[PDB]
Amino acid sequence: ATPEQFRQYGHQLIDLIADYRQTVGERPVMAQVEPGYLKAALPATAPQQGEPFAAILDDVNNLVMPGLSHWQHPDFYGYFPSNGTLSSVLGDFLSTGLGVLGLSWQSSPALSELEETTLDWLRQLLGLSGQWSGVIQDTASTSTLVALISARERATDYALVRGGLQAEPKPLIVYVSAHAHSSVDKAALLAGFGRDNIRLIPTDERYALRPEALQAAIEQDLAAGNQPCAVVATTGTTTTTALDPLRPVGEIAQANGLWLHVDSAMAGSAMILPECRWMWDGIELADSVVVNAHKWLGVAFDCSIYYVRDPQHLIRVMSTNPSYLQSAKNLRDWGIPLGRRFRALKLWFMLRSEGVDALQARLRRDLDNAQWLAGQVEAAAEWEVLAPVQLQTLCIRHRPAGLEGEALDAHTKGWAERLNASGAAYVTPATLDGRWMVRVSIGALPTERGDVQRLWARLQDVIKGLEHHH
Numbered sequence: 001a002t003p004e005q006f007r008q009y010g011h012q013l014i015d016l017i018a019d020y021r022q023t024v025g026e027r028p029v030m031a032q033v034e035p036g037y038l039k040a041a042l043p044a045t046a047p048q049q050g051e052p053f054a055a056i057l058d059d060v061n062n063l064v065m066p067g068l069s070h071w072q073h074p075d076f077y078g079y080f081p082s083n084g085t086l087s088s089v090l091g092d093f094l095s096t097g098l099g100v101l102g103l104s105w106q107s108s109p110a111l112s113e114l115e116e117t118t119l120d121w122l123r124q125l126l127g128l129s130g131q132w133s134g135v136i137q138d139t140a141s142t143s144t145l146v147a148l149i150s151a152r153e154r155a156t157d158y159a160l161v162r163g164g165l166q167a168e169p170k171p172l173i174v175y176v177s178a179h180a181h182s183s184v185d186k187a188a189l190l191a192g193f194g195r196d197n198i199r200l201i202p203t204d205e206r207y208a209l210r211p212e213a214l215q216a217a218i219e220q221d222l223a224a225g226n227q228p229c230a231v232v233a234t235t236g237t238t239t240t241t242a243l244d245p246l247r248p249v250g251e252i253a254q255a256n257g258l259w260l261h262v263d264s265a266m267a268g269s270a271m272i273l274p275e276c277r278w279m280w281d282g283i284e285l286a287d288s289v290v291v292n293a294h295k296w297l298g299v300a301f302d303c304s305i306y307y308v309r310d311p312q313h314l315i316r317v318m319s320t321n322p323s324y325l326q327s328a329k330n331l332r333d334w335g336i337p338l339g340r341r342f343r344a345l346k347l348w349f350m351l352r353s354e355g356v357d358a359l360q361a362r363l364r365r366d367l368d369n370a371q372w373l374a375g376q377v378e379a380a381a382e383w384e385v386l387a388p389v390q391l392q393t394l395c396i397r398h399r400p401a402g403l404e405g406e407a408l409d410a411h412t413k414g415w416a417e418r419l420n421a422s423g424a425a426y427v428t429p430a431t432l433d434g435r436w437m438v439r440v441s442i443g444a445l446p447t448e449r450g451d452v453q454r455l456w457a458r459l460q461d462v463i464k465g466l467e468h469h470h
C-alpha cells in the first residue's frame with residue numbers, strides 16, 4: 001500500500017476497532033467454533049498477486065471474528081485479565097507505524113529514553129525505593145528466566161564465561177512455593193536447573209509458602225552437599241492469589257546468600273494503590289521483581305516490567321561481560337532480545353491519557369466488586385468460597401447435598417463448561433487441594449458492578465439448567 005492507500009485503510013480499521021470495543025459485550029465471551037474451522041476456511045497457499053483490503057476486512061468479519069474469545073469483554077472472568085486500555089492501544093499504533101527499532105541508543109534515542117522515564121514513572125507509582133531500575137520484557141515468563149539466569153550467574157561466579165552449568169561441583173537448587181505459576185518451573189528448566197533441583201515449599205492455610213519450610217529445605221540441601229541458589233516468591237498466585245510473605249523469606253534468602261526473585265505479575269499493579277502495599281512488605285529485600293502492566297494495569301500486551309536493584313549484575317550477565325562496572329543506557333544488555341520496538345509509547349500514552357486517579361479507581365473497582373460477589377457466594381446456601389479474597393479473584397464451588405469426590409469434580413467442570421458454552425461469561429476451572437473448583441477473575445476493562453451482578457445470576461441459573469444466549 002502507498003502511505004495514502006494505508007491512510008484510507010487506516011480509517012476503515014480505526015472504525016472497525018471502535019465498533020468492536022463498543023459492542024463487544026453483545027457477543028459470546030468465548031469462541032463458539034470447532035477446531036479446524038479457520039484452516040478449512042482459508043486458502044491453502046498465499047496469493048500470487050495482491051488482493052484488495054476490503055477482501056481482507058470481509059474475511060476479518062466473516063472468518064476471524066467468530067473464532068475469538070473476547071478478553072476485553074464486560075463478562076470475561078477467566079485466567080487473569082489481559083487489559084488493553086484504548087490509550088495504550090493508541091500508543092501501540094504509533095510504535096508500529098513509526099517503524100523504529102532499538103538495537104542501541106543511537107538507533108533511536110527517543111525509544112530508550114522514553115522507556116527509561118516511564119519505567120521510573122511507574123517505579124514511583126508502585127512505591128518502590130530508588131535502588132530499583134527496570135526494563136520492559138515481553139512476558140513475566142521471560143522475566144523469571146532472566147532472574148533465574150541472573151541467580152545462576154551470581155552463585156556460580158559468572159561461570160558462563162567458563163565451564164558453564166555442567167562444570168559446577170554442586171547442584172544449584174531453586175526454591176519456589178508449591179502454588180508458584182508453571183512459568184517459574186519452566187524458567188528453571190530452560191536455565192538448566194533440572195526438575196530434581198526445584199524443591200516445592202509447602203503452603204499454609206492461605207496457600208502462602210511457609211518460611212519455616214524454606215529454611216528447613218535450605219538446611220537439608222547444605223546437609224546434602226547441594227548448593228542452594230535462588231528463592232522465587234509469588235505475590236498473587238494464579239490459583240487463589242495467595243501472598244507469599246516476603247519479609248521472612250527475604251531475610252532467609254539474605255542470610256544464606258541466595259537470589260530472591262519475586263513473581264508479582266498479576267498483583268503487581270495493585271501496588272499503585274497505597275492501601276495494598278502491605279502485600280509487598282519485604283520487597284525491598286528482593287533482588288528482582290516483575291509486574292505485568294499488560295495484565296490488570298491495562299497496557300496492551302506485550303509489556304512486562306522487570307526491576308532489579310543490581311542492574312550492573314544484569315548487564316554483566318546479558319552482555320556476557322562480567323568485568324563490567326556501572327561506575328566506570330543500552331537496553332540490549334537488560335534482557336534476552338537485543339532489539340526492541342517502541343513499547344514505551346504504550347506506557348507513556350496510558351499513564352498520561354488516563355491519569356493515576358483513573359487507574360487507581362479502576363483497580364479499586366475490581367477489588368470492591370470481588371468483595372461483593374464473595375459476600376453473595378458466602379451467604380448463598382450450597383455455595384462456598386475456597387480461599388481468601390485478598391485481591392480480585394474468587395475460588396468458588398457449588399455443593400449439591402451428598403455430592404463428594406469425583407462426582408462433584410464432574411459436577412463442577414460440567415457446569416463450568418456449560419456456563420462458558422452459553423456465551424454469558426468466561427470462567428477458568430482450576431484445581432485446589434486435589435479438588436476441582438472454578439475461578440472468577442474480575443478485572444476486564446468494562447467489568448462494573450452491573451456486570452458482576454449478572455454473572456452472579458447466571459452462575460445460580462446454570463446449575464438449575466438455565467443458560468442465556470444473546
Ligand SMILES: *Cc1c(COP(=O)(O)O)cnc(C)c1O
Nearest residue numbers: 139140141181183236238265266
Ligand atoms: C500470568 C502470570 C505469569 C505468566 O506471565 P506471562 O506474562 O504470561 O509470561 C507468571 N506468574 C504469575 C503469578 C502470573 O499471574
